[PDB]
């Protein structure tokens, strides 16, 4: 699954974009392998 934990926060791994879709409610983002882990998973 595209689930990635940043520290202890459950984030979602977006493969294909560098921008967290600002239509969810993300607070933080981790630069992941060719993708971005945006948390929390909203």
Curated annotation (Swiss-Prot):
Q: Which GO terms fall under molecular function for this chain's record?
A: ion channel inhibitor activity; potassium channel regulator activity; sodium channel regulator activity; toxin activity
Q: Which keywords does UniProt give here?
A: Antibiotic, Antimicrobial, Disulfide bond, Ion channel impairing toxin, Nematocyst, Neurotoxin, Potassium channel impairing toxin, Secreted, Toxin, Voltage-gated potassium channel impairing toxin, Voltage-gated sodium channel impairing toxin
- Disulphide bond pairs: 4-37, 6-30, 20-38
What does the record give as the function of this protein? Peptide with both antimicrobial and neurotoxin activities. This toxin acts both on ERG potassium channels and sodium channels. It potently and reversibly inhibits human Kv11.1/KCNH2/ERG1 (IC(50)=34 nM), rat Kv11.1/KCNH2/ERG1 and Kv11.3/KCNH7/ERG3 voltage-gated potassium channels in a similar potency. It acts as a gating-modifier toxin that shifts the voltage-dependence of ERG activation in the positive direction and suppresses its current amplitudes elicited by strong depolarizing pulses.
A single Gene Ontology CC term: extracellular region
Q: Per its UniProt record, what InterPro entries does this chain match?
A: BDS_K_chnl_tox (IPR012414), Myo_ane_neurotoxin_sf (IPR023355)
Nucleotide-binding as UniProt keyword: no
Record protein name field: Kappa-actitoxin-Ael2a
* Family per record: Belongs to the sea anemone type 3 (BDS) potassium channel toxin family.
Q: Does the keyword Disulfide bond apply?
A: yes
Q: Where in the cell is it found?
A: Secreted; Nematocyst
Domains: entry comment: Has the CSbeta/beta fold, which comprises anti-parallel beta-sheets stabilized by three or four disulfide bonds.
Q: Name one GO biological process term.
A: defense response to bacterium
Protein species of origin = Anthopleura elegantissima (Green aggregating anemone)
Please share what else the UniProt entry notes about this protein: Negative results: does not block Kv11.2/KCNH6/ERG2, Kv1.1/KCNA1, Kv1.2/KCNA2, Kv1.3/KCNA3, Kv1.5/KCNA5, Kv1.6/KCNA6, Kv2.1/KCNB1, Kv3.4/KCNC4, Kv4.2/KCND2, Kv7.1/KCNQ1, Kv7.2/KCNQ2, Kv7.3/KCNQ3, Kv10.1/EAG1/KCNH1 and Kv12.3/ELK1/KCNH4. Weakly inhibits Kv1.4 KCNA4 (27%). Does not inhibit Nav1.7/SCN9A and insect DmNav1 and BgNav1.
